[PDB]
Design an enzyme around this catalytic site. Structure first.
Site, mmCIF file in Angstrom:
data_model
loop_
_atom_site.group_PDB
_atom_site.id
_atom_site.type_symbol
_atom_site.label_atom_id
_atom_site.label_comp_id
_atom_site.label_asym_id
_atom_site.label_seq_id
_atom_site.Cartn_x
_atom_site.Cartn_y
_atom_site.Cartn_z
ATOM 1 N N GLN A 185 -52.581 14.474 38.484
ATOM 2 C CA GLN A 185 -52.117 14.634 37.100
ATOM 3 C C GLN A 185 -52.665 15.993 36.564
ATOM 4 O OE1 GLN A 185 -51.690 11.286 33.395
ATOM 5 N NE2 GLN A 185 -52.741 10.664 35.316
ATOM 6 N N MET A 226 -64.206 10.766 30.950
ATOM 7 C CA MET A 226 -64.942 9.659 31.553
ATOM 8 C C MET A 226 -63.951 8.522 31.901
ATOM 9 S SD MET A 226 -67.890 7.706 29.883
ATOM 10 C CE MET A 226 -67.643 8.123 28.159
ATOM 11 N N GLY A 227 -64.235 7.677 32.888
ATOM 12 C CA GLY A 227 -63.264 6.602 33.251
ATOM 13 C C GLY A 227 -61.926 7.202 33.710
ATOM 14 N N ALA A 228 -60.902 6.348 33.832
ATOM 15 C CA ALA A 228 -59.519 6.739 34.164
ATOM 16 C C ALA A 228 -58.849 7.642 33.128
ATOM 17 C CB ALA A 228 -58.676 5.497 34.362
ATOM 18 N N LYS A 275 -60.624 10.732 17.866
ATOM 19 C CA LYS A 275 -60.669 9.244 17.853
ATOM 20 C C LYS A 275 -62.062 8.705 17.700
ATOM 21 C CE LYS A 275 -59.780 4.743 19.473
ATOM 22 N NZ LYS A 275 -61.235 4.413 19.397
ATOM 23 N N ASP A 276 -62.995 9.165 18.527
ATOM 24 C CA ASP A 276 -64.396 8.835 18.319
ATOM 25 C C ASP A 276 -65.041 9.894 17.432
ATOM 26 O OD1 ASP A 276 -67.257 7.736 20.383
ATOM 27 O OD2 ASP A 276 -67.087 8.106 18.194
ATOM 28 N N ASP A 312 -54.899 10.463 41.996
ATOM 29 C CA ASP A 312 -53.742 10.670 41.145
ATOM 30 C C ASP A 312 -54.118 11.208 39.775
ATOM 31 O OD1 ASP A 312 -51.342 9.230 42.868
ATOM 32 O OD2 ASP A 312 -53.326 8.258 43.104
ATOM 33 N N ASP A 313 -55.339 10.914 39.318
ATOM 34 C CA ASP A 313 -55.880 11.625 38.160
ATOM 35 C C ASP A 313 -55.918 13.126 38.497
ATOM 36 O OD1 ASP A 313 -56.029 9.309 36.642
ATOM 37 O OD2 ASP A 313 -58.218 9.237 36.526
ATOM 38 N N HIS A 360 -56.643 12.458 26.859
ATOM 39 C CA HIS A 360 -57.215 13.530 27.660
ATOM 40 C C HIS A 360 -56.176 14.630 27.969
ATOM 41 C CE1 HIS A 360 -59.776 10.050 29.406
ATOM 42 N NE2 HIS A 360 -60.551 10.711 28.554
ATOM 43 N N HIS A 380 -56.173 9.276 30.607
ATOM 44 C CA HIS A 380 -55.081 8.790 29.711
ATOM 45 C C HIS A 380 -54.396 9.927 28.932
ATOM 46 C CE1 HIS A 380 -58.783 8.265 27.120
ATOM 47 N NE2 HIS A 380 -58.033 9.026 26.340
ATOM 48 N N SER A 386 -56.673 4.557 23.658
ATOM 49 C CA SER A 386 -57.981 4.126 24.163
ATOM 50 C C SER A 386 -57.743 3.333 25.423
ATOM 51 C CB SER A 386 -58.739 3.291 23.120
ATOM 52 O OG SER A 386 -59.814 2.557 23.723
ATOM 53 N N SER A 387 -58.697 3.413 26.343
ATOM 54 C CA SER A 387 -58.500 2.760 27.619
ATOM 55 C C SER A 387 -58.571 1.261 27.348
ATOM 56 C CB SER A 387 -59.550 3.226 28.653
ATOM 57 O OG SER A 387 -60.820 3.117 28.096
ATOM 58 N N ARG A 388 -59.211 0.864 26.244
ATOM 59 C CA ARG A 388 -59.309 -0.576 25.921
ATOM 60 C C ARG A 388 -57.968 -1.223 25.589
ATOM 61 N NH1 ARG A 388 -64.667 -1.047 22.998
ATOM 62 N NH2 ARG A 388 -66.086 0.164 24.340
HETATM 63 C C1 LIG Z 1 -56.237 13.785 21.623
HETATM 64 O O1 LIG Z 1 -56.198 12.372 21.421
HETATM 65 C C2 LIG Z 1 -57.138 11.542 22.000
HETATM 66 C C3 LIG Z 1 -57.084 10.178 21.688
HETATM 67 C C4 LIG Z 1 -58.025 9.306 22.301
HETATM 68 C C5 LIG Z 1 -58.992 9.793 23.106
HETATM 69 C C6 LIG Z 1 -59.083 11.139 23.380
HETATM 70 C C7 LIG Z 1 -58.181 11.991 22.822
HETATM 71 C C8 LIG Z 1 -60.117 11.333 24.213
HETATM 72 C C9 LIG Z 1 -60.689 10.114 24.451
HETATM 73 C C10 LIG Z 1 -61.756 9.858 25.288
HETATM 74 O O2 LIG Z 1 -61.824 8.843 26.009
HETATM 75 N N1 LIG Z 1 -62.711 10.769 25.349
HETATM 76 S S1 LIG Z 1 -64.012 10.602 26.423
HETATM 77 O O3 LIG Z 1 -64.864 9.354 26.148
HETATM 78 O O4 LIG Z 1 -63.539 10.613 27.854
HETATM 79 C C11 LIG Z 1 -64.995 12.085 26.070
HETATM 80 C C12 LIG Z 1 -66.233 12.018 26.741
HETATM 81 C C13 LIG Z 1 -67.303 11.372 26.118
HETATM 82 C C14 LIG Z 1 -68.528 11.309 26.806
HETATM 83 C C15 LIG Z 1 -68.737 11.870 28.049
HETATM 84 C C16 LIG Z 1 -70.064 11.813 28.650
HETATM 85 F F1 LIG Z 1 -70.025 11.814 29.881
HETATM 86 F F2 LIG Z 1 -70.688 12.841 28.241
HETATM 87 F F3 LIG Z 1 -70.784 10.822 28.348
HETATM 88 C C17 LIG Z 1 -67.659 12.537 28.673
HETATM 89 C C18 LIG Z 1 -66.399 12.584 28.010
HETATM 90 N N2 LIG Z 1 -59.984 9.184 23.754
HETATM 91 C C19 LIG Z 1 -60.206 7.684 23.660
HETATM 92 C C20 LIG Z 1 -61.616 7.413 23.038
HETATM 93 O O5 LIG Z 1 -62.303 8.343 22.476
HETATM 94 O O6 LIG Z 1 -62.044 6.263 23.247
#
Ligand SMILES: COc1ccc2c(c1)cc(C(=O)NS(=O)(=O)Cc1ccc(C(F)(F)F)cc1)n2CC(=O)O
Ligand SMILES: COc1ccc2c(c1)cc(C(=O)NS(=O)(=O)Cc1ccc(C(F)(F)F)cc1)n2CC(=O)O
Lengths: 272, 274
Positions: free
Chosen positions: A76, A40-42, A144-145, A72-73, A47, A44, A180-182
């Site tokens: 990537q 989701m979003g840009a 992370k989440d 560019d995503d 992902h 990083h 995190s994108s934050r």
């Molecule tokens: C392997 O190491 C990492 C470290 C941080 C990561 C990730 C992996 C993955 C993320 C991340 O942003 N995951 S996400 O929010 O893009 C997964 C995601 C959640 C919900 C949806 C939706 F559309 F279903 F709602 C889609 C993708 N993040 C940042 C985070 O969870 O905020």
């Protein structure tokens, strides 16, 4: 019907649910193991680590969903050897509006569900849909989440979904800050202070040989040494996010506000 | 996988067993047909099975499960069904109620008005059944029309790769819609119960004269009936809303006879379409 065009070894981009559904099914039938990496979003580094983990399963085809340099995503993703990008519009995902939805269990009301009480219902609903469109053998999420990861394992179990959930250890900056994108919004004082979340957690994980209270008090001391870090919670739970057993495996979770940015982190804990 | 004897009735109680069997059959080319039941099988259920049997190369799965049998299996074997799926409550809900399906606003209407979590329970089990069995087609009677619609919404909303087949409601010789709950009518009740279907067909023919004449005809027939207490009598679009009706729709009725609640419904064409 004809299977939509798919070029093996190239980045193939589909916006239609039907199309990615037909292609993934055709691939499943030719032997490939379909791996799903939702995003989701840009894009990083977190992902990309999910992508690398999925690519190493032998005979994998990797599907990355993108549900917002967007080109560019995609470049990537191509450079990573991803063969499918699924890029649907909100309309395509919701052609009848909001209707049938997933209602999470009581875990969704806790922790992150305090400031954001309907957030996980929306996540689980879209994840279920992605799972049914693509039908992957495995689906990959960061740890992370962690609350979100636990909730989709509950979704998978409770609705008897055939898919393996793979949680990938959290990619960190060199000083420990969880990706995190934050992180891009933090000024330098905020960025220097934000290191305390991960420092507290890793301290607690090593202090844990001296037991649960020692681990918690170590975390809290580290958080207490940082300016401008408003801790919303600091909780030690079992690995399923239920109550922490007397000893055994657990997870320590923290959330804090730095200015207007909410940061979260968590870590494996082993008691004694 | 567990044993599968083709051309015999194979009964599975573990979800993993039916899932494995089902997956093995689909890979070898059979199309998997699912007929969900709550047991107490009647001829309406047999009609569902018969419809599923006539899909070329079908293997038919009948599930039997009541949300928390000597007759039932007999008939299934006599129909040439090769799979019965009889899970335990513990195997379906090892964690109690946790993640559930929340239906759209149709689930709060009609049958769902006094029973506001009823359809959530149904859709959650039907979703689980679909995921365990992963059939090509699933069959439901039209008699619980609201249920059938909410099932279609489920299947569309969650992108499930299954075709939902509605089968027209089997009826006793006087028009009474088949139902498990018919056995609960005393002879006087069973006599009066013909009014529901008499009412709905009277409306379907009255409807050349408009929707009001159609509703009015049905109401007079319901009113002339001994000990029939009308819950609701409603005319709606075929998807049951939130659109106004145009020229083709569904007329639904729910009524009490003593303690027994009976439902029925019929396709209605209004004016020219009639
Ligand atoms: C392997 O190491 C990492 C470290 C941080 C990561 C990730 C992996 C993955 C993320 C991340 O942003 N995951 S996400 O929010 O893009 C997964 C995601 C959640 C919900 C949806 C939706 F559309 F279903 F709602 C889609 C993708 N993040 C940042 C985070 O969870 O905020
Ligand atoms: C084609 O002619 C008919 C006529 C009547 C029929 C049927 C077919 C089928 C039924 C019937 O009992 N359908 S059902 O509600 O039991 C289908 C069903 C619903 C929920 C579940 C559960 F396991 F999810 F709960 C299982 C089956 N009935 C009775 C009825 O729907 O009340």
């Amino acid at each position: 019907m004809a299977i939509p065009a798919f070029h093996p070894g190239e980045l193939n981009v589909y916006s239609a649910p039907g199309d990615v559904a037909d292609v993934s099914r055709a691939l499943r039938l030719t032997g490939r193991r379909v791996m799903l990496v939702p995003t989701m979003g840009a894009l990083h580094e977190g992902h990309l680590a999910l992508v690398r983990a999925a690519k190493r399963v032998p005979g994998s085809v990797v599907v990355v969903s993108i549900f917002v340099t967007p080109d560019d995503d995609l470049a990537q993703l191509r450079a990573e050897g991803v063969e499918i990008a699924f890029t649907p519009t909100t309309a395509a995902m919701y052609p009848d509006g909001l209707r049938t939805t997933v209602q999470p269990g009581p875990l969704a009301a806790e922790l992150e569900g305090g400031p954001r009480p309907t957030h996980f219902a929306g996540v689980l609903t879209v994840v279920l849909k992605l799972l049914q469109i693509v039908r992957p053998d495995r689906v990959f999420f960061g740890e992370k989440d962690y609350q979100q990861l636990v909730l989709i394992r509950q979704l998978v179990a409770d609705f008897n979904l055939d898919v393996a959930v793979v949680g990938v250890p959290t990619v960190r900056e060199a000083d420990g800050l969880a990706m995190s994108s934050r992180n891009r919004y933090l000024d330098p004082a905020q960025r220097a202070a934000a290191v305390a979340l991960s420092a507290a957690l890793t301290a607690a994980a090593h202090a844990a040989t001296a037991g649960a209270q020692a681990a918690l008090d170590a975390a809290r001391a580290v958080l207490d040494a940082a300016p401008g870090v408003a801790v919303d919670y600091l909780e030690l739970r079992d690995i399923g996010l239920g109550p922490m057993p007397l000893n055994g495996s657990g997870r320590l979770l923290v959330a804090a506000r730095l200015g207007t940015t909410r940061l979260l982190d968590n870590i494996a804990i082993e008691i004694g």
